[PDB]
Amino acid sequence: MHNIYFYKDKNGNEPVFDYMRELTSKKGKDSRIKLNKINDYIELLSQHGTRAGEPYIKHLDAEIWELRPLRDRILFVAWMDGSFVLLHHFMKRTQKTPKREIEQAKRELADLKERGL
Amino acid sequence: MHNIYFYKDKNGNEPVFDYMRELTSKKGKDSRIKLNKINDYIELLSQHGTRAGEPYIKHLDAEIWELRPLRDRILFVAWMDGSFVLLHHFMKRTQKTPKREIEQAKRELADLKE
Amino acid sequence: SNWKDVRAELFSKEEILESDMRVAIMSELIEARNEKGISQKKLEEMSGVSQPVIARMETGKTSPQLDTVLKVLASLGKTLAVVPLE
Amino acid sequence: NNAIGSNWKDVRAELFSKEEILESDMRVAIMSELIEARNEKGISQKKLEEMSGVSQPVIARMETGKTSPQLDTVLKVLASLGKTLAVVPLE
Secondary structure, rough: OOOOOOOOOOOOOOOOHOOOOOOOOOOOOOOHHHHHHHHHHHHHHHHHHHOOOOOOOOOOOOOOOOOOOOOOOOOOOOOOOOOOOOOOOOOOOOOOOOOOOOOOOOOOOOOOHHHOO | OOEEEEOOOOOOOHHHHHHHHHHHHHHHHHHHHHHHHHHHHHHHHHHEEEEEEEEOEEEEOOOOEEEEEOOOEEEEEOOOOOEEEEEEEEEOOOOOOOHHHHHHHHHHHHHHHO | OOOOHHHHHOOOOOHHHHHHHHHHHHHHHHHHHHHOOOOOOOHHHHHOOOOOHHHHHHHOOOEEHHHHHHHHHHOEEEEEEEEEEO | OOOEEEEHHHHHHHHHOHHHHHHHHHHHHHHHHHHHHHHHHHOOHHHHHHOOOOOOHHHHHHHHOOOOEHHHHHHHHHHHEEEEEEEEEOO
Protein backbone atom coordinates (compact mmCIF):
# COMPACT_ATOMS: atom_id res chain seq x y z
CA MET A 1 0.00 0.00 0.00
CA HIS A 2 0.97 3.58 -0.97
CA ASN A 3 4.54 4.08 -2.25
CA ILE A 4 6.00 7.65 -2.06
CA TYR A 5 8.43 9.01 -4.69
CA PHE A 6 10.56 12.19 -4.90
CA TYR A 7 10.89 14.83 -7.54
CA LYS A 8 12.89 16.37 -10.51
CA ASP A 9 14.19 20.03 -11.02
CA LYS A 10 16.73 21.79 -13.35
CA ASN A 11 20.01 19.85 -12.92
CA GLY A 12 18.26 17.63 -11.50
CA ASN A 13 19.91 18.71 -8.18
CA GLU A 14 16.92 19.09 -5.89
CA PRO A 15 17.40 20.57 -2.40
CA VAL A 16 14.08 19.88 -0.59
CA PHE A 17 16.25 17.80 1.85
CA ASP A 18 19.01 20.06 3.23
CA TYR A 19 16.27 21.23 5.25
CA MET A 20 16.43 17.35 6.00
CA ARG A 21 20.28 17.76 5.82
CA GLU A 22 22.28 20.35 7.88
CA LEU A 23 19.93 19.65 10.73
CA THR A 24 22.03 16.48 10.35
CA SER A 25 24.90 18.97 10.69
CA LYS A 26 23.60 20.23 13.95
CA LYS A 27 23.59 18.63 17.29
CA GLY A 28 21.54 15.64 18.71
CA LYS A 29 17.79 16.40 18.61
CA ASP A 30 16.51 19.94 18.88
CA SER A 31 17.58 19.67 15.13
CA ARG A 32 16.09 16.22 14.69
CA ILE A 33 13.00 16.71 16.84
CA LYS A 34 12.51 19.59 14.39
CA LEU A 35 12.72 16.88 11.69
CA ASN A 36 11.76 13.62 13.33
CA LYS A 37 8.79 15.86 12.19
CA ILE A 38 7.88 14.19 9.00
CA ASN A 39 9.71 10.97 9.10
CA ASP A 40 6.50 10.92 11.05
CA TYR A 41 4.16 12.79 8.58
CA ILE A 42 5.61 11.23 5.45
CA GLU A 43 5.52 7.88 7.12
CA LEU A 44 2.00 8.75 8.17
CA LEU A 45 1.22 9.18 4.48
CA SER A 46 2.33 5.91 2.95
CA GLN A 47 0.21 4.04 5.55
CA HIS A 48 -2.85 6.22 5.54
CA GLY A 49 -2.80 7.96 2.22
CA THR A 50 -5.07 10.55 3.54
CA ARG A 51 -7.99 8.63 5.04
CA ALA A 52 -7.82 10.59 7.69
CA GLY A 53 -5.52 12.69 6.88
CA GLU A 54 -6.51 15.74 8.94
CA PRO A 55 -6.28 17.40 11.47
CA TYR A 56 -2.79 17.53 10.04
CA ILE A 57 -2.52 16.76 6.89
CA LYS A 58 -3.92 20.21 5.57
CA HIS A 59 -5.57 22.16 2.76
CA LEU A 60 -5.53 25.89 2.05
CA ASP A 61 -6.93 26.16 -1.42
CA ALA A 62 -7.06 24.69 -5.01
CA GLU A 63 -6.13 21.04 -5.53
CA ILE A 64 -4.88 19.83 -2.43
CA TRP A 65 -2.96 18.10 0.29
CA GLU A 66 -0.98 18.19 3.33
CA LEU A 67 0.77 18.57 6.81
CA ARG A 68 2.12 19.10 10.63
CA PRO A 69 1.57 20.37 14.32
CA LEU A 70 4.46 23.12 15.36
CA ARG A 71 5.82 26.33 13.31
CA ASP A 72 5.24 25.67 9.95
CA ARG A 73 5.72 24.04 6.38
CA ILE A 74 4.14 22.80 3.32
CA LEU A 75 1.29 22.62 0.91
CA PHE A 76 1.93 19.59 -1.30
CA VAL A 77 0.30 16.99 -3.61
CA ALA A 78 -0.23 15.42 -6.99
CA TRP A 79 -2.91 12.97 -8.14
CA MET A 80 -1.35 9.97 -9.98
CA ASP A 81 -0.72 7.69 -7.12
CA GLY A 82 -0.39 6.41 -4.47
CA SER A 83 2.59 8.51 -4.07
CA PHE A 84 3.36 12.09 -5.03
CA VAL A 85 6.15 14.26 -3.35
CA LEU A 86 7.81 17.54 -4.89
CA LEU A 87 8.60 21.17 -3.92
CA HIS A 88 10.01 23.21 -1.11
CA HIS A 89 9.71 24.12 2.33
CA PHE A 90 10.62 27.59 3.87
CA MET A 91 9.34 29.17 7.19
CA LYS A 92 7.28 31.64 8.89
CA ARG A 93 5.39 34.13 10.94
CA THR A 94 1.92 32.64 10.66
CA GLN A 95 -0.97 32.62 11.75
CA LYS A 96 -1.82 34.88 8.72
CA THR A 97 0.40 32.81 6.82
CA PRO A 98 0.04 33.81 3.44
CA LYS A 99 -1.99 35.14 0.54
CA ARG A 100 1.50 35.17 -1.22
CA GLU A 101 2.61 31.49 -0.35
CA ILE A 102 -0.61 30.07 -1.63
CA GLU A 103 1.02 31.27 -4.85
CA GLN A 104 4.36 30.04 -3.64
CA ALA A 105 2.03 27.06 -2.92
CA LYS A 106 1.24 26.82 -6.46
CA ARG A 107 4.11 28.17 -8.21
CA GLU A 108 3.59 24.47 -8.07
CA LEU A 109 1.60 22.55 -10.64
CA ALA A 110 4.11 23.86 -13.12
CA ASP A 111 5.38 20.78 -11.24
CA LEU A 112 2.36 18.38 -11.63
CA LYS A 113 2.15 19.90 -15.21
CA GLU A 114 4.27 19.12 -18.23
CA ARG A 115 6.81 18.26 -15.56
CA GLY A 116 4.60 15.10 -15.31
CA LEU A 117 4.62 14.76 -19.17
CA MET B 1 2.54 -23.55 31.05
CA HIS B 2 3.67 -24.19 34.62
CA ASN B 3 0.66 -24.31 36.83
CA ILE B 4 0.89 -22.61 40.22
CA TYR B 5 -1.14 -23.54 43.27
CA PHE B 6 -1.45 -21.58 46.43
CA TYR B 7 -0.84 -23.67 49.52
CA LYS B 8 -4.09 -23.86 51.49
CA ASP B 9 -3.61 -24.72 55.15
CA LYS B 10 -5.88 -26.81 57.42
CA ASN B 11 -8.34 -23.93 58.11
CA GLY B 12 -8.13 -23.75 54.96
CA ASN B 13 -6.72 -20.35 54.09
CA GLU B 14 -4.17 -19.59 51.41
CA PRO B 15 -1.60 -17.50 53.18
CA VAL B 16 -0.05 -16.02 50.07
CA PHE B 17 -3.46 -15.31 48.63
CA ASP B 18 -4.43 -13.88 52.01
CA TYR B 19 -1.68 -11.36 51.78
CA MET B 20 -2.69 -10.42 48.26
CA ARG B 21 -6.29 -9.42 48.87
CA GLU B 22 -4.94 -7.55 51.84
CA LEU B 23 -2.73 -5.64 49.29
CA THR B 24 -5.89 -5.15 47.28
CA SER B 25 -7.94 -4.14 50.40
CA LYS B 26 -5.84 -0.96 50.92
CA LYS B 27 -5.14 2.13 48.76
CA GLY B 28 -1.90 3.91 48.10
CA LYS B 29 0.37 3.71 45.10
CA ASP B 30 2.56 1.47 47.31
CA SER B 31 -0.14 -1.17 47.57
CA ARG B 32 -0.35 -1.29 43.76
CA ILE B 33 3.41 -1.15 43.22
CA LYS B 34 3.91 -4.18 45.40
CA LEU B 35 0.91 -5.97 44.10
CA ASN B 36 1.95 -5.29 40.51
CA LYS B 37 5.50 -6.51 41.22
CA ILE B 38 4.13 -9.64 42.71
CA ASN B 39 1.72 -10.12 39.75
CA ASP B 40 4.76 -9.84 37.50
CA TYR B 41 6.90 -12.38 39.24
CA ILE B 42 4.42 -15.17 39.62
CA GLU B 43 3.58 -14.67 35.89
CA LEU B 44 7.27 -14.95 35.23
CA LEU B 45 7.48 -18.07 37.42
CA SER B 46 4.52 -19.54 35.59
CA GLN B 47 6.04 -19.12 32.10
CA HIS B 48 9.75 -19.75 32.94
CA GLY B 49 9.97 -22.10 35.96
CA THR B 50 13.21 -21.66 37.86
CA ARG B 51 15.30 -20.91 34.79
CA ALA B 52 14.11 -17.34 35.40
CA GLY B 53 17.36 -16.98 37.35
CA GLU B 54 18.15 -13.90 39.39
CA PRO B 55 16.84 -11.31 40.32
CA TYR B 56 13.29 -12.88 40.25
CA ILE B 57 14.51 -16.26 41.98
CA LYS B 58 17.15 -17.52 44.45
CA HIS B 59 17.40 -21.17 45.60
CA LEU B 60 17.51 -21.42 49.41
CA ASP B 61 17.40 -24.81 51.13
CA ALA B 62 16.45 -28.23 49.77
CA GLU B 63 13.35 -27.85 47.57
CA ILE B 64 12.29 -24.46 49.16
CA TRP B 65 12.87 -21.51 46.87
CA GLU B 66 12.19 -17.73 47.00
CA LEU B 67 10.50 -15.56 44.47
CA ARG B 68 11.88 -12.02 45.08
CA PRO B 69 9.55 -9.09 43.95
CA LEU B 70 10.72 -5.78 45.43
CA ARG B 71 10.91 -6.48 49.10
CA ASP B 72 8.36 -9.25 49.46
CA ARG B 73 9.67 -12.80 49.71
CA ILE B 74 7.42 -15.62 48.52
CA LEU B 75 8.54 -19.20 49.34
CA PHE B 76 7.48 -21.80 46.81
CA VAL B 77 8.41 -25.47 45.98
CA ALA B 78 8.83 -27.57 42.84
CA TRP B 79 5.66 -29.82 42.26
CA MET B 80 3.80 -32.28 40.03
CA ASP B 81 4.65 -32.47 36.35
CA GLY B 82 5.78 -29.77 36.91
CA SER B 83 4.35 -26.98 38.76
CA PHE B 84 4.74 -25.06 42.02
CA VAL B 85 3.21 -24.29 45.24
CA LEU B 86 3.48 -21.00 46.87
CA LEU B 87 3.74 -21.55 50.54
CA HIS B 88 3.73 -18.37 52.45
CA HIS B 89 5.13 -14.83 52.32
CA PHE B 90 7.32 -12.50 54.27
CA MET B 91 9.23 -9.23 53.99
CA LYS B 92 13.03 -9.15 53.92
CA ARG B 93 14.32 -7.45 57.06
CA THR B 94 17.91 -8.92 56.78
CA GLN B 95 20.74 -9.88 54.40
CA LYS B 96 20.64 -13.33 55.89
CA THR B 97 17.40 -15.24 55.25
CA PRO B 98 15.67 -15.75 58.60
CA LYS B 99 16.01 -19.48 59.26
CA ARG B 100 12.69 -19.26 61.07
CA GLU B 101 10.87 -18.64 57.70
CA ILE B 102 12.61 -21.61 56.04
CA GLU B 103 11.42 -24.19 58.67
CA GLN B 104 7.94 -22.76 58.33
CA ALA B 105 8.20 -23.54 54.60
CA LYS B 106 9.59 -27.09 55.22
CA ARG B 107 6.68 -27.65 57.59
CA GLU B 108 4.26 -26.56 54.85
CA LEU B 109 5.87 -28.71 52.21
CA ALA B 110 5.30 -31.44 54.94
CA ASP B 111 1.61 -30.84 55.21
CA LEU B 112 1.51 -30.91 51.40
CA LYS B 113 2.18 -34.64 51.42
CA GLU B 114 -1.09 -36.49 52.34
CA SER C 1 13.42 9.27 -5.87
CA ASN C 2 11.68 7.09 -3.27
CA TRP C 3 10.76 7.37 0.40
CA LYS C 4 12.01 4.04 1.75
CA ASP C 5 15.36 4.79 0.19
CA VAL C 6 15.86 8.36 1.53
CA ARG C 7 14.46 7.33 4.95
CA ALA C 8 17.29 4.78 5.15
CA GLU C 9 19.84 7.47 4.10
CA LEU C 10 18.82 10.30 6.60
CA PHE C 11 17.99 7.73 9.32
CA SER C 12 18.77 3.97 9.70
CA LYS C 13 17.40 1.29 11.98
CA GLU C 14 18.01 3.92 14.71
CA GLU C 15 15.00 6.38 15.04
CA ILE C 16 12.89 4.92 12.24
CA LEU C 17 11.70 2.51 14.92
CA GLU C 18 10.58 5.32 17.15
CA SER C 19 8.84 6.96 14.20
CA ASP C 20 7.21 3.72 13.03
CA MET C 21 5.92 3.52 16.53
CA ARG C 22 4.86 7.14 16.87
CA VAL C 23 3.20 6.90 13.44
CA ALA C 24 1.31 3.74 14.58
CA ILE C 25 -0.19 5.36 17.66
CA MET C 26 -1.12 8.41 15.55
CA SER C 27 -3.01 6.06 13.23
CA GLU C 28 -5.17 4.45 15.98
CA LEU C 29 -5.90 7.79 17.45
CA ILE C 30 -6.72 9.30 14.06
CA GLU C 31 -8.65 6.21 12.89
CA ALA C 32 -10.62 6.48 16.14
CA ARG C 33 -11.45 10.20 15.90
CA ASN C 34 -12.37 9.76 12.29
CA GLU C 35 -13.67 6.33 11.33
CA LYS C 36 -15.34 5.15 14.59
CA GLY C 37 -16.44 8.63 15.79
CA ILE C 38 -14.85 8.38 19.22
CA SER C 39 -13.87 11.67 20.83
CA GLN C 40 -10.82 12.50 22.81
CA LYS C 41 -12.82 13.34 25.90
CA LYS C 42 -14.69 10.08 25.62
CA LEU C 43 -11.20 8.57 25.33
CA GLU C 44 -10.32 10.08 28.72
CA GLU C 45 -13.63 8.60 29.86
CA MET C 46 -13.11 5.04 28.73
CA SER C 47 -9.35 4.94 29.57
CA GLY C 48 -8.84 7.29 32.59
CA VAL C 49 -5.80 8.92 30.87
CA SER C 50 -5.49 12.72 31.23
CA GLN C 51 -6.54 13.92 27.83
CA PRO C 52 -3.55 16.37 27.70
CA VAL C 53 -1.36 13.23 28.08
CA ILE C 54 -3.43 11.80 25.25
CA ALA C 55 -2.94 14.94 23.02
CA ARG C 56 0.67 14.89 23.70
CA MET C 57 0.48 11.31 22.52
CA GLU C 58 -0.70 11.97 19.05
CA THR C 59 1.85 14.66 18.51
CA GLY C 60 5.48 13.47 18.46
CA LYS C 61 6.18 15.39 21.68
CA THR C 62 8.75 12.84 22.99
CA SER C 63 7.80 9.21 24.07
CA PRO C 64 4.95 8.70 26.63
CA GLN C 65 4.96 5.95 29.25
CA LEU C 66 4.60 2.24 28.42
CA ASP C 67 1.66 2.06 30.77
CA THR C 68 -0.34 5.15 29.61
CA VAL C 69 0.12 4.10 26.02
CA LEU C 70 -1.34 0.65 26.89
CA LYS C 71 -4.64 1.86 28.59
CA VAL C 72 -5.49 4.22 25.67
CA LEU C 73 -4.87 1.45 23.08
CA ALA C 74 -6.61 -0.97 25.31
CA SER C 75 -9.80 1.02 25.16
CA LEU C 76 -9.79 1.08 21.35
CA GLY C 77 -9.35 -2.63 21.70
CA LYS C 78 -5.71 -2.68 20.73
CA THR C 79 -2.43 -3.57 22.51
CA LEU C 80 1.33 -3.70 21.98
CA ALA C 81 2.85 -7.18 21.44
CA VAL C 82 6.62 -8.03 21.11
CA VAL C 83 7.74 -9.17 17.67
CA PRO C 84 10.89 -10.23 15.81
CA LEU C 85 13.22 -8.36 13.34
CA GLU C 86 12.63 -7.58 9.62
CA ASN D 1 -4.42 -33.43 47.34
CA ASN D 2 -6.24 -31.00 49.87
CA ALA D 3 -3.97 -28.32 51.29
CA ILE D 4 -3.35 -27.61 47.61
CA GLY D 5 -5.31 -24.44 46.76
CA SER D 6 -6.32 -22.08 44.01
CA ASN D 7 -4.60 -22.16 40.60
CA TRP D 8 -2.84 -18.80 39.82
CA LYS D 9 -4.83 -18.36 36.67
CA ASP D 10 -7.91 -18.06 38.94
CA VAL D 11 -6.35 -15.87 41.62
CA ARG D 12 -4.89 -13.51 39.05
CA ALA D 13 -8.45 -12.96 37.64
CA GLU D 14 -10.33 -12.49 40.91
CA LEU D 15 -7.76 -9.84 41.89
CA PHE D 16 -6.94 -7.93 38.67
CA SER D 17 -8.76 -5.86 36.21
CA LYS D 18 -8.24 -7.27 32.76
CA GLU D 19 -6.27 -4.07 32.05
CA GLU D 20 -4.08 -4.53 35.15
CA ILE D 21 -3.59 -7.98 33.64
CA LEU D 22 -2.70 -6.49 30.27
CA GLU D 23 -0.40 -3.92 31.67
CA SER D 24 1.40 -6.83 33.46
CA ASP D 25 1.57 -9.41 30.59
CA MET D 26 3.43 -6.85 28.92
CA ARG D 27 5.84 -5.85 31.75
CA VAL D 28 6.34 -9.54 31.97
CA ALA D 29 6.86 -10.01 28.39
CA ILE D 30 9.80 -7.42 28.48
CA MET D 31 11.40 -9.02 31.59
CA SER D 32 11.27 -12.08 29.56
CA GLU D 33 13.50 -10.72 26.75
CA LEU D 34 16.12 -9.64 29.34
CA ILE D 35 16.06 -13.18 30.87
CA GLU D 36 16.78 -14.63 27.46
CA ALA D 37 19.55 -12.10 27.02
CA ARG D 38 21.23 -13.06 30.24
CA ASN D 39 20.87 -16.92 29.96
CA GLU D 40 20.51 -17.76 26.38
CA LYS D 41 22.05 -15.07 24.04
CA GLY D 42 24.71 -14.19 26.71
CA ILE D 43 24.49 -10.48 26.73
CA SER D 44 25.34 -8.87 29.97
CA GLN D 45 23.28 -5.82 30.55
CA LYS D 46 26.47 -3.70 30.76
CA LYS D 47 26.96 -4.85 27.21
CA LEU D 48 23.53 -3.74 26.40
CA GLU D 49 23.98 -0.24 27.85
CA GLU D 50 26.69 -0.08 25.24
CA MET D 51 24.65 -1.34 22.28
CA SER D 52 21.66 0.77 23.03
CA GLY D 53 22.97 3.72 24.96
CA VAL D 54 20.41 3.10 27.72
CA SER D 55 21.98 3.40 31.19
CA GLN D 56 22.49 0.17 33.22
CA PRO D 57 20.11 1.36 35.89
CA VAL D 58 17.46 2.08 33.34
CA ILE D 59 17.55 -1.34 31.89
CA ALA D 60 17.48 -3.07 35.28
CA ARG D 61 14.35 -1.11 36.44
CA MET D 62 12.66 -2.95 33.64
CA GLU D 63 13.24 -5.97 35.86
CA THR D 64 13.35 -4.52 39.37
CA GLY D 65 11.78 -0.96 39.47
CA LYS D 66 8.38 0.30 40.81
CA THR D 67 7.41 2.33 37.61
CA SER D 68 6.87 1.89 33.85
CA PRO D 69 9.39 3.02 31.28
CA GLN D 70 8.84 5.76 28.82
CA LEU D 71 8.53 4.20 25.40
CA ASP D 72 11.61 4.98 23.44
CA THR D 73 13.93 3.38 26.05
CA VAL D 74 12.13 0.09 25.48
CA LEU D 75 12.39 0.36 21.75
CA LYS D 76 16.04 1.06 22.01
CA VAL D 77 16.65 -1.92 24.28
CA LEU D 78 14.43 -4.40 22.41
CA ALA D 79 16.10 -3.18 19.23
CA SER D 80 19.51 -4.50 20.18
CA LEU D 81 17.82 -7.68 21.54
CA GLY D 82 16.42 -7.64 18.03
CA LYS D 83 12.77 -7.04 18.82
CA THR D 84 10.30 -4.20 18.51
CA LEU D 85 6.87 -3.49 19.77
CA ALA D 86 3.85 -3.69 17.33
CA VAL D 87 0.22 -2.60 17.58
CA VAL D 88 -2.04 -5.73 17.35
CA PRO D 89 -5.80 -6.47 17.82
CA LEU D 90 -6.70 -6.76 21.53
CA GLU D 91 -7.79 -10.31 22.39
